[PDB]
Amino acid sequence: DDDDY
Amino acid sequence: AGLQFPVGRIARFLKAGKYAERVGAGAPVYLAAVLEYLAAEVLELAGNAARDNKKTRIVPRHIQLAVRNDEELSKLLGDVTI
Amino acid sequence: TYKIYIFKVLKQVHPDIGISSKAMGIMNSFINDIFEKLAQESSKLARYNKKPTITSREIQTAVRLVLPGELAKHAVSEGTKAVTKFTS
Secondary structure, X not given: OOXXX | OOOOOOOHHHHHHHHHOOOOOEEOOHHXXXXXXXXXXXXXXXXXXXXXXXXXXXXXXXXXXXXXXXXXXXXXXXXXHOOOOO | OOHHHHHHHHHHHOOXXXXXXXXXXXXXXXXXXXXXXXXXXXHHHHHOOOOOEEOHHHHHXXXXXXXOHHHHHXXXXXXXXXXXXXXX
16 A cells, blocks of 8 residues: 555 | 655754765755656656556556566666565 | 656656566666666876866866766767756
């Protein structure tokens, strides 16, 4: 998982 | 100077690491403009890869593709993993 | 950290494109690595003088040595313009 900055 | 990148922390950092005992007022401006130029180059290419792949955000894969397809960025930055 | 400045530049070049947390970490590592390469190089150049002094001349040389040729040429021009706008 890689959420918005 | 036109820039978005910060000129202020550079002189302090250079003195505190003893990179030099003195820093000219032009040096931080020059250096921030160079770092901004390189960020803009990578982002523009990474964003092009995102759009080409019909994405609305840059993910690691897009930066890896951008650096890999650019001879000078690959030389400057090295391999991008994941 | 350069992340906020990288974000602002992303929005000038690609107004409609975002960036993941992991991608922004990579951008920020690139900028720190280059900073250190240019700072280290400028440190050697300035080491010739007593009272070692980093000026825009040392940065300019450091850029021409560390960056690949076409990147170096555009960066030097960007560096020069920014110091001209600041100066005048």
